[PDB]
Design a protein around this ligand. Structure first.
Ligand SMILES: Cc1cc2nc3c(=O)[nH]c(=O)nc-3n(C[C@H](O)[C@H](O)[C@H](O)COP(=O)(O)OP(=O)(O)OC[C@H]3O[C@@H](n4cnc5c(N)ncnc54)[C@H](O)[C@@H]3O)c2cc1C
Ligand SMILES: *[C@@H]1O[C@H](CO)[C@@H](O)[C@H](O)[C@H]1NC(C)=O
Ligand SMILES: *[C@@H]1O[C@H](CO)[C@@H](O)[C@H](O)[C@H]1NC(C)=O
Ligand SMILES: *[C@@H]1O[C@H](CO)[C@@H](O)[C@H](O)[C@H]1NC(C)=O
Ligand SMILES: *[C@@H]1O[C@H](CO)[C@@H](O)[C@H](O)[C@H]1NC(C)=O
Ligand SMILES: *[C@@H]1O[C@H](CO)[C@@H](O)[C@H](O)[C@H]1NC(C)=O
Ligand SMILES: *[C@@H]1O[C@H](CO)[C@@H](O)[C@H](O)[C@H]1NC(C)=O
Ligand SMILES: *[C@@H]1O[C@H](CO)[C@@H](O)[C@H](O)[C@H]1NC(C)=O
Ligand SMILES: *[C@@H]1O[C@H](CO)[C@@H](O)[C@H](O)[C@H]1NC(C)=O
Ligand SMILES: CC1(C)OCc2cc(C=O)ccc2O1
Length: 514
């Protein structure tokens, strides 16, 4: 149930149109906002039976060829953000550099390619009445299209031997499942280095029913006057002109604009906390105190070693999983322009030689913050976001445990060949940045050297904004499907879950209607 090596399939471009085209305006059965990780499979799925309009603010990935290879991963983060690029830069109010996607295919067009299924306990933990058999068939539908078993990479094999030696057991071999132990997982880079992404799932939609508008910046959700319902959207094109599209009958608008874009759009449309919106003189359409609340970013903490002999660059494929920390490492060429957000600030030393980035992820996390509007009218102006890293002490204690484990990993035989000096301790490695340092000093290391893992989620939670069917409570014909919906990560690497979730919810909408 896995995909082959092949070129990125752009056949779907035959139904992709510039949002300047006013013939796109009119009535549809479904409008999907955000052509990303969840939105692309969701729109393709709905188009099997119904007329779908998919609206995406970014352009097409062919415009930026470095999004199409493993080799280009760094380039897209190094590229300056001119407002059109696939990578949009931002800084949380915590002061931590970060990025989100602005491109058809969403974050699967810019990410590190790691594919994994949700922790199988995640479903009962949510309390949603999942159709579990359907979930697994949907995973296979995604995997058959874009996931492969990766080939060996020498550094990934080193790191896998070290995880095992350091006691991250058992050895799970090759597996897509999020389970304790060390494993090789799937990748959306194929064995030729070609990137596969959510946009390619548009190829599974019906070309007679699915229309895609790019450089369509959705500014407002439109509602009925009465029985409050969503009825359509306002979006502007790359020239600045405005356009309207509607749903009809028993159809629906679904927001799939991401952790950041979905709460932003809901607020701008008057769905959010009564007090906050009134203070901005935004008319309240549906008061809900949780829109933009419970927004999470799992911490990344890391060390960099500079081996005395060169190592080969590699994409992450080998995972070391415990309940309280998830670990990986990438080996990378040197660079003199930093990939934005790889390190938490722009003033961070640059590597002269090949290096290994060795990393630990805090699960959850338990610390949370919020998304608030910067402009009360302009969707192209980025919202304020704060994550409050390490405000919850359980997160800190887990970073401490993870950092001690990376210490054990640096002490393994597998890693010994990468020390500069053949001494007994780990100060035999050459480090880029702060090395590992008791308890109080690991806490200070965790707090001072944290970065984003880029796996941020929340802001429109099931049980706070949405019901168990992803419907916005109080409003008919409006749903939200993307990473804004859950308060905890489904696994170490969540694109698999959100690719699946797009199609799954699409199938649930088709079922309800039928
Ligand atoms: C650099 C990076 C590396 C990552 N690496 C990995 C990894 O290796 N493995 C992994 O599993 N996960 C990884 N992730 C995380 C994972 O890819 C994301 O969590 C997930 O893809 C986000 O899903 P989404 O649908 O919520 O968002 P997106 O995929 O970003 O979808 C949102 C889309 O909506 C569009 N949009 C937003 N606002 C509007 C609007 N107003 N009008 C129209 N369109 C709009 C956006 O441009 C975007 O295309 C990575 C994340 C980043 C940032
Ligand atoms: C591998 O990638 C190269 C470079 O992008 C491409 O020219 C070639 O056709 C690919 N191989 C296969 C078998 O698709
Ligand atoms: C859409 O058309 C405008 C010209 O009106 C152009 O500047 C823009 O690049 C086009 N976008 C795409 C994705 O073709
Ligand atoms: C779904 O697949 C997982 C493996 O990813 C397996 O553990 C589980 O038993 C399957 N569930 C069902 C309902 O078949
Ligand atoms: C990688 O594992 C492969 C499995 O395809 C096997 O052929 C071989 O033992 C390994 N190859 C290298 C180059 O180490
Ligand atoms: C909202 O409008 C009132 C006038 O109706 C004004 O007094 C108040 O300052 C406005 N607040 C903002 C934030 O625009
Ligand atoms: C999987 O999820 C369950 C329940 O949420 C949790 O107890 C367990 O720690 C998780 N397993 C891993 C390997 O993260
Ligand atoms: C908008 O963003 C700017 C610059 O990022 C920030 O300094 C400012 O406080 C924000 N304004 C509001 C009203 O949130
Ligand atoms: C951390 O989060 C837990 C679980 O959500 C919560 O009960 C607790 O209040 C938080 N602890 C601190 C110290 O903030
Ligand atoms: C774990 C992580 C973040 O994954 C991807 C990655 C890529 C580069 C390329 O420059 C460098 C380091 C790195 O580490």
């Amino acid at each position: 149930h896995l995909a082959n090596t092949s070129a990125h399939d752009f056949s779907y471009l035959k139904f992709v149109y510039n949002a300047t085209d006013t013939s796109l305006e009119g009535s549809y059965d479904y409008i999907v906002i955000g052509g990303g990780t969840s939105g692309c499979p969701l729109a393709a799925t709905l188009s099997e039976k119904y007329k779908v309009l998919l609206l995406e603010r970014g352009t097409i990935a062919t415009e930026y060829p470095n999004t199409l290879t493993a080799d280009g991963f760094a380039y897209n983060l190094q590229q300056q953000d001119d407002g059109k690029t696939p990578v949009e830069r931002f800084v949380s109010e915590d002061g931590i550099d970060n990025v989100r996607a602005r491109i058809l295919g969403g974050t699967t067009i810019i990410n590190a390619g790691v594919y994994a299924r949700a922790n199988i306990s995640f479903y009962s933990q949510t309390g949603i009445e999942w159709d579990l058999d359907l979930v697994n068939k949907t995973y296979e539908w995604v995997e058959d299209a874009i996931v492969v078993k990766p080939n060996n990479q020498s550094w990934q094999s080193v790191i896998g031997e070290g995880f095992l030696e350091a006691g991250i057991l058992p050895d799970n071999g090759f597996s897509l499942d999020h389970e304790a132990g060390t494993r090789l997982t799937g990748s959306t880079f194929d064995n030729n280095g070609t990137r596969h992404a959510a946009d390619e799932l548009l190829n599974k939609g019906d070309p007679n029913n699915l229309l895609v508008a790019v450089q369509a910046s959705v500014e407002k959700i439109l509602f009925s006057s009465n029985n409050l319902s969503a009825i359509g959207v306002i979006y502007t094109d790359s020239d600045g002109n405005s356009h309207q599209a509607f749903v009809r009958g028993n159809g629906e608008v679904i927001v799939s604009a991401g952790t950041i874009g979905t709460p932003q759009l809901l607020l701008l449309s008057g769905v959010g906390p009564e007090s906050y919106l009134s203070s901005l003189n935004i008319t309240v359409v549906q008061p809900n105190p949780y829109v933009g609340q419970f927004v999470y970013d799992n911490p990344r903490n890391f060390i960099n070693i500079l081996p005395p002999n060169p190592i080969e660059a590699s994409v992450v494929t080998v995972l070391g999983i415990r309940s309280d920390y998830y670990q990986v490492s990438a080996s990378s060429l040197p660079f003199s322009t930093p990939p934005f957000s790889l390190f938490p600030t722009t003033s961070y030393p640059l590597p002269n030689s090949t290096f290994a980035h060795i990393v630990s992820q805090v699960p959850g996390p338990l610390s949370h913050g919020s998304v608030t509007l910067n402009s009360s009218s302009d969707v192209r102006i980025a919202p304020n976001i704060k994550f409050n890293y390490y405000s919850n002490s359980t997160d800190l204690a887990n970073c401490v445990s993870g950092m001690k484990k990376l210490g054990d990993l640096l002490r393994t035989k597998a890693l010994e060949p990468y020390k500069a000096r053949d001494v007994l301790g780990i100060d035999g490695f050459n480090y880029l940045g702060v090395p590992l340092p008791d308890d109080a000093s690991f806490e200070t290391f965790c707090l001072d050297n944290v970065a984003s893992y880029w796996h941020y989620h929340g802001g429109s939670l099931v049980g706070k904004v949405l019901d168990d069917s992803f419907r916005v409570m109080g409003i008919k014909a409006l749903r939200v499907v993307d990473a804004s919906t859950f308060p905890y990560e489904p696994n170490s690497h969540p694109q698999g879950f959100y690719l699946m979730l797009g199609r799954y919810v699409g199938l649930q909408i088709l079922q309800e209607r039928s």
